[PDB]
UniProtKB/Swiss-Prot annotation:
Monomer. The keyword Transferase applies. Changing residue 111 to L: Risk factor for thrombocytosis; enhanced generation of reactive oxygen species (ROS) leading to impaired megakaryocyte differentiation; abolished NAD(P)H-dependent reductase activity. It is found in: Cytoplasm. The gene is BLVRB. It comes from the Eukaryota. One of its GO terms (cellular component) is cytoplasm. GO terms for molecular function: biliverdin reductase [NAD(P)+] activity; FMN reductase (NADH) activity; FMN reductase (NADPH) activity; peptidyl-cysteine S-nitrosylase activity; riboflavin reductase (NADPH) activity. It comes from Homo sapiens (Human). Its EC number is 1.5.1.30, 1.3.1.-, 2.6.99.-. The active site is at 109 (s-nitroso-cysteine intermediate), 188 (s-nitroso-cysteine intermediate). This is Flavin reductase (NADPH).
Length: 205
């Protein structure tokens, strides 16, 4: 069940690339903000609008949010586990841009670790999780219609469209395919029922 319009942050990442592809195939008119467009597939279905810039730069974010109906956030740091503020700085700029333009809907990916007992989060992942927590707080405090997508391990299994979604939020499987995760990000554009909730998509493959 697919849908049509939007801006994607993090479209060049693992989940971003398939979310972008699914969004264009679905019929969405998609804008992306990318640091470097050579990381978009010079092949795959082409976004309506590519803007080159940095989510840390407010004016770049403002340009990419202008005129959108909703915002999808798949920012991340790849396999870099170092301390970072990119996601929380990005979220702050996204919130400011959404407020200025009257955009209300943001679907943003952090991590299922925000649903764990904090004493059980793997220490090596704590610096990244800290910035996920910072980003989530920014989005919660914004008062915008915010779906918090908190996935467990992101796998590479093909798209099923058959995953489960648990609200607020633990969840019985510890994996979600990147393709199913992107499918779910876009599904969240089709309904208000997850707004203000945390969501944990998962599946057994
Ligand atoms: N198992 C897992 O890996 C797992 C589990 C749970 C949650 N998560 C979280 O899920 C999210 C998505 O992960 P993923 O692996 O699909 O993403 P990823 O491969 O880490 O991609 C990160 C994306 O963010 C973009 N980005 C980074 N810094 C930026 C900046 N300053 N300005 C603009 N764009 C920037 C990257 O662009 P560039 O291409 O220019 O770098 C890329 O598009 C991440 O937050 C991750 O921590 C991951």
């Amino acid at each position: 069940m697919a849908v049509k319009k939007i801006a994607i942050f993090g479209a060049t990442g693992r989940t971003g690339l398939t979310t972008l592809a699914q969004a264009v195939q679905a019929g969405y008119e998609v804008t992306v903000l990318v640091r470097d467009s050579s990381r978009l597939p010079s092949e795959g279905p082409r976004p309506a609008h590519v803007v080159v810039g940095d989510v840390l730069q407010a004016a770049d974010v403002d340009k990419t949010v202008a005129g959108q109906d909703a915002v999808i956030v798949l920012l991340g740091t790849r396999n870099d586990l170092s301390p970072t503020t990119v996601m929380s700085e990005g979220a702050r700029n996204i919130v400011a841009a959404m407020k200025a333009h009257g955009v209300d809907k943001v679907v943003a990916c952090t991590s299922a670790f925000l649903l764990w007992d904090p004493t059980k989060v793997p220490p090596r992942l704590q610096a990244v999780t800290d910035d996920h927590i910072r980003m989530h707080k920014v989005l919660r405090e914004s008062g915008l219609k915010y779906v918090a997508v908190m996935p467990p391990h992101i796998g590479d299994q093909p798209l099923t469209g058959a995953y489960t979604v648990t609200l607020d939020g633990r969840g019985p499987s510890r994996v979600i395919s990147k393709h199913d995760l992107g499918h779910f990000m876009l599904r969240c554009l089709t309904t208000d029922e997850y707004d203000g909730h945390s969501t944990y998509p998962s599946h057994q493959y």
